[PDB]
């Protein structure tokens, strides 16, 4: 019971209590008494755990506080955490209202929508509270189920509407609700029957201890397209440019090292900011309006010294090769120097390279490339690709050439991809000696 809280008045010096059908302030604050335990629930109602009822007052026309069945409409059961204090002070003839035991205001523990998994409600969130077999529930329950799985109604009256779904769980395994890749031990959840917005889908994955699908490897694309063959669907993935336009990122902060945009994508930069995978294109990526309602896919996984003319940063040595060469020839020159084309794994390393090594050189080669397999970028030095810093609407050279290599471009230190044909200076990286 982490969302539950007591309501204290400094002006009356006591906690708000609900007895029978009445509401009072008692100086005897006791966090154990459910009569004093409150909880925000759906549709801006304030729920009491002792009475299993909702705080209410009269509509304009008859003013007092009382407890009422939460589905009563003949009374106003709606409150706002910002004005609740003023309403309580008004109706009790009081000062300042806070959560008991803290300096936090009554807006500190807000109601969060919990989106359902599978069931028959297309991902619609739990209606809190809901009635089932004439009993109120202010949370998920397994009563009425043998397997013990937690569920909830998506209307307030299950007996009437029979709309429901499974509740999301934060698990250390991937048992009931997930397809697991045995090779990578990564778990995937295709909610074909749900219809949620991107942000809603994001929240759903998050409250399962997961994130929207990121596709980081060529294999991962193949495994994903695999499970999708036969189905006909368009599903949200973690891809978006909400922060920076054209700056596509995975919601789970994975590097944008693999790409599978459809031929004409992405487009409509002014309206479409979120990524979808499609079965029609055999797993191609599109960008769409983030507010549209779609099925979605979740994912979870249960001080050195340098040689002369080189400069140190962290544990490596860096050097500018000012002579303009091709990407491959730039690399060959780095190797003869006992190093390789620079690999960049953090923002601090990037800043060092850009401010200290590149300086006013306009554009130059780094180690990132997709010569081996196209649309799948890797560092020439074989290092793990953990970090990308693409310019807006980059990369995009796989859209023409069959071989793409990467440069640092301009003062921000962001990256382009380009034909390796191009003649540019470059930066080299090798390990340093400690010291
Ligand atoms: Na589009
Ligand atoms: Na490019």
Residue numbers in the entry: 40 to 101, 105 to 136, 156 to 363, 379 to 511
Q: What wording appears in the published article?
A:
The C-type mannose receptor and its homolog Endo180 (or uPARAP, for urokinase plasminogen activator receptor-associated protein) mediate the endocytic uptake of collagen by macrophages and fibroblasts. The large extracellular region of each of these receptors consists of an N-terminal ricin B-like domain, followed by a fibronectin type II (FN2) domain and eight (MR, Endo180, PLA2R) or ten (DEC-205) C-type lectin (CTL) domains. Here, we present the crystal and solution structures of domains 1–4 (D1-4) of Endo180 and a mutational analysis of collagen binding. The Endo180 D1-4 region adopts an L-shaped structure with a short arm (∼60 Å length) consisting of the ricin-like and FN2 domains, and a longer arm (∼80 Å length) consisting of the two CTL domains.
